[PDB]
Design a protein around this nucleic acid. Sequence first.
DNA 1: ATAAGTTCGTATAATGTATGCTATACGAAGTTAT
DNA 2: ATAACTTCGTATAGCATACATTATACGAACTTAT
DNA 3: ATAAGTTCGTATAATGTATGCTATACGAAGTTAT
DNA 4: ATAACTTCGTATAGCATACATTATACGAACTTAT
Lengths: 319, 324, 319, 324
Amino acid sequence: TSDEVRKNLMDMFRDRQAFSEHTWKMLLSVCRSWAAWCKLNNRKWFPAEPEDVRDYLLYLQARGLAVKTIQQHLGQLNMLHRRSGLPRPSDSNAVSLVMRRIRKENVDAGERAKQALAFERTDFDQVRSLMENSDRCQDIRNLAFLGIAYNTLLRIAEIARIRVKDISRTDGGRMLIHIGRTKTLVSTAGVEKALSLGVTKLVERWISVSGVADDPNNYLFCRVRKNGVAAPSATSQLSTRALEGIFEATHRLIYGAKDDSGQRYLAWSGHSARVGAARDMARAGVSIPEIMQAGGWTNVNIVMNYIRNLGAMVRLLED
Amino acid sequence: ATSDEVRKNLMDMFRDRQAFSEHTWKMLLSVCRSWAAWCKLNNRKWFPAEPEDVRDYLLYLQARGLAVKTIQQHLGQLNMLHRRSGLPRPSDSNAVSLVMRRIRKENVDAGERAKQALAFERTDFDQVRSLMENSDRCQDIRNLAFLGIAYNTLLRIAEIARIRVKDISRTDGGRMLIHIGRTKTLVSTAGVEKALSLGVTKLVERWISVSGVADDPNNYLFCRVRKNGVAAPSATSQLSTRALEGIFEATHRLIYGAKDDSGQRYLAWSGHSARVGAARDMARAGVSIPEIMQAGGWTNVNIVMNYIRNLDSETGAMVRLLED
Amino acid sequence: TSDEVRKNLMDMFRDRQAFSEHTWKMLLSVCRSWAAWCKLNNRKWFPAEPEDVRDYLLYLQARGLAVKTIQQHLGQLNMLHRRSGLPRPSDSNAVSLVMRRIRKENVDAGERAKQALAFERTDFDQVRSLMENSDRCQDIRNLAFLGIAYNTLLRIAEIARIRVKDISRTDGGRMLIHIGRTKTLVSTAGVEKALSLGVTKLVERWISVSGVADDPNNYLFCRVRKNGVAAPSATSQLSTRALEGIFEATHRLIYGAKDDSGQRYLAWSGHSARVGAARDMARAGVSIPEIMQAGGWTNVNIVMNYIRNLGAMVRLLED
Amino acid sequence: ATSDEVRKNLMDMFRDRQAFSEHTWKMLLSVCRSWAAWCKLNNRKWFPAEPEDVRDYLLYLQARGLAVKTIQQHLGQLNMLHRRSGLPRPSDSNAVSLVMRRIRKENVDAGERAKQALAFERTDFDQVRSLMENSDRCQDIRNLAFLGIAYNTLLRIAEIARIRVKDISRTDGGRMLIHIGRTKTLVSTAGVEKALSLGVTKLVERWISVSGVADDPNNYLFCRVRKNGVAAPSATSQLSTRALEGIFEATHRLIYGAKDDSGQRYLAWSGHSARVGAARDMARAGVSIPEIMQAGGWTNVNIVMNYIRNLDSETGAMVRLLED
DNA sequence: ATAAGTTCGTATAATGTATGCTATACGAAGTTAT
DNA sequence: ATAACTTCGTATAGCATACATTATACGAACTTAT
DNA sequence: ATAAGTTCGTATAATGTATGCTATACGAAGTTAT
DNA sequence: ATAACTTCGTATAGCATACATTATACGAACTTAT
């Protein structure tokens, strides 16, 4: 009750670190949204009334937002309440059923959550075939990045977190990248992402022209200014936003500027090589169980999602 | 759980009824009618449902010789009616939990057989193809394209009915592709492409010359053909799934005759036969569990497995070892 | 309370079928035991007092019983109570900890739960090599049984439940045995246990000399009297106790009469071919995932248990 | 939870203390002492433990630079002390749950490294074997047999100490088998047999001529050797695991010298080194994950996996594809 | 007499963990246009 | 004196026993068609 | 001036589900017999 | 009349969306060393 809510909420703010910085950014972005919808209609934003939550989801739906975004708003509200020691909006038929209904009506009109434009071995080979010959710091960095992204399948944020001290060697001379935390795990054991001899070379070239290896505690990737001078750091990472820019720029290099549609995934992006690699592995005949360790997935669906038709019966028949 | 809460819960249900498929509602209504009539008959109250009363009903359903999976559907819908109304579910009562268990146990031990569609394999398509490709009959031509697009594709009945003519291409060689949509999962697919042979694509040509189905593209590929053998396209009505089940039943009668062995199910061919046979054929010629637990969108096994079980290729490692 | 207990217990007896006939036999055997220990010491057997349960387990321990048997007594008592709507003995430190302690002290003195003498391809081949030539009804039956036991790995009770109507054909001519319920599953889908061409023959010979195929609803296996005349039935199964006797007799045939030790597993028994087959599969190089479907196991431990050392390092070293 | 209930719970604990290993009790006592002293120091009550107080302690432990797995052990033992006394566990409080999470998150992001034993691979055994097989020294002879039975076998330290002379055979060729017992699981094993080479079995011969360890069979294979280089068998005392850890540390000093790089762990060889190296060697020559996630009784992976990770044979499918 | 069980009691080993929403099945009753 | 330990205590890496039931193991007492 | 970011907000895709008992680590303090 | 359906209702086989969070997608506003 009131005192208890102030304490539960307060207890949450104290140990903020317990959750991702991003969960907080969304908690707040959703609350900003809901509070706004609430003011305009003179309703109390907290605790939220199921019926109010319901008109809110319907209102997001009418704004033409994705089922996933609508489910994000409901999930943030649910967390605020549950962690508040209060009932969850989803705990009410009104909210439970409207969610189902919005999802159901949205899909049955098409809506499908999207996946990033793939970046496979071919694009890597072509891009490398062209960038290989550059002596520019930016280019050397960007090719090492793409190479690591394709080879390791790590998420951009995990790549930005790599520190020089995290790199080792196999004996065959292959670089070994030690991975601490991921979206799926936060352990002291952790992974050892290995690189192919060619990708190591690539990386090796970047560490060299950049002088990041200066401090072991330095981030593997950093800014590189117009003058071609890198700017190593053990406190600031190269933003995932910039990493996303590498993918976009590399795609703009080969295919030119993008549509005017305003759609997403017109060019490669942070997850392009993960999708792309996962795939390439399927074809090669790699074992799902294997395609899975590559991406660090403890399950089979995403994996399943990334490779398909979206044939065989035409040969039995065809003969 | 207070009748005012319940009344609010029931209005919630009706207000957001689009939360469920109409098939689901149909089943819910059906179970309630059955449950209500039995309560009347037996002098019990049907809402809310009392555990002892629901237990007596589940036994009544078993005594009726219904399938363990059917008794499940009943308890299931009841459980939802109460769960989504604010009352305790019947499944939450010891007596209801115990009886379902026993009943399940008793049935499996009387020989309870989970059935699956009678295969419609290539040997079947060829033979049918044999008795028909030479038929001038508008309905004979149409029913060929169908078994073609059902077998060549493993598409579901509710799925072929949906198909429009504005959904076909010509890809790789007078072949033809059918952009589908055999998913309804948001994080699945948008649609796919199913291709055809000299078998399929062709038959699917004669159906268009005679169906004159392509005159307008909003239309649907498959339409009804009246007694005079005249076609009637439509961008507004699709052939019923019942009608497609008919073409399968009709087709099996032509070869084997009068309804057979009892009043049982799957005595002939049904909507799923084509998908069942396509698989085994695909498993017989050893074709990876990709276009097997996949070709008919089964990103989810036992299915391709319950279908190819009696096959010899799926005999197991013991037979393989015993035989060297 | 009292009324509630009488009803919970009563509700259990009404739908007796909900559980295995064997669970009941043990519920009662344990209660008989506990009630006996209780009378001798003037204690109330129900509800059971943790401290009383504890001296009871210690008393079983002192009688030299197996940890597993002691855990069976505690588990039956726990079920009587839990299903009674009363606390479980194990819900008390006294009972919780004494169990741990008895287990701990028993193992640390050796104790290891045993597994049945294996019956592998070799024993099958030898036994068949000798029995093959018999024209006796008993022998033909017994060889078909052993063959099915080894080939299918089914538990004896599942084998006794096979009915003629359950048998089919693959096309290659191989027999297919449909399995309804197992210890691990009670479903309408169920399994299709296949037999090798040689084992089918064997079976085929038994169905023939026996005339069980007379009624489809007849049990595949039945008694066979001294006069050599089988005795088909669709109501009585050949007891699992007799099936166990086939294994023992076949072993006595080849190796003679058993020890005087009074130990278990001196000869083959109901589970001998399951262990034996599982094993043979390991060696063949069969995939655990495969060794697993054979036995119908939805997990990896038992499977793991049955094949081991209980070598490789002596070649690296040896060279 | 009433002090009379608690007092009964604590007597229950002491009465059936044999429910736990003495190592476990040692750790429990240790955590309590640490928790008690900090409560005193900070003016808090140590029993029962208050969530805010336990949260302040877990932060104190982190500020102390302890490993996330060590803070876990503390909370863990506290949670048990309270669980087995009838009081609510600290882990059951939002504040304690949240802080453990954060702390875990914060640590993994400072580079928290889970360490494993420094390998003691064949290259290591040969080289050591090289610098010693020619040593007359009683202790030099004994320490060879040991690294032999540790590497050739992957047996654990607490395990080789247990070994008796009445546990050896002669099997297949002057070899020798060591019936063990590397299990303590009731539904595991009774014991096993570990075999040896011309490498091992032999060294294990010279240790017996000089140790005169076999004079009586109740004795244990490995014994202490005093400063005069004289042996002292015993059917009653086994070499401490500390002593076996010593032979590993001593041995690495002989080759590399004075304790190295900081006060860190695994700077030299430790009891687990032999099992770590045996594996990689076994993985390097491509030897199935049987005598790999098995040879050292690991019916339970990540172990053989955390050990052979930097290896080239375990590089992954991406490297394999990128390299053709 | 007796082989070949059955039944039964105590003893001990072996094993999974689950649903609930939506489609097809099929006899039939209802509807159109030949 | 120190070598060679053992015992300690705190630190951390490596595992594996509790639920709830369902089944098999085996001697011995009883049952029936020969 | 400006390339090359950073930061930040709204929008939307992607993913696991967990511990707690027992062993080893290692510096050190304590114990024996050379 | 019936063929050829469609609509129904009860029976059953075949699937796949809810949690709780943590992450990426991308335009645009701002920041800094050149």
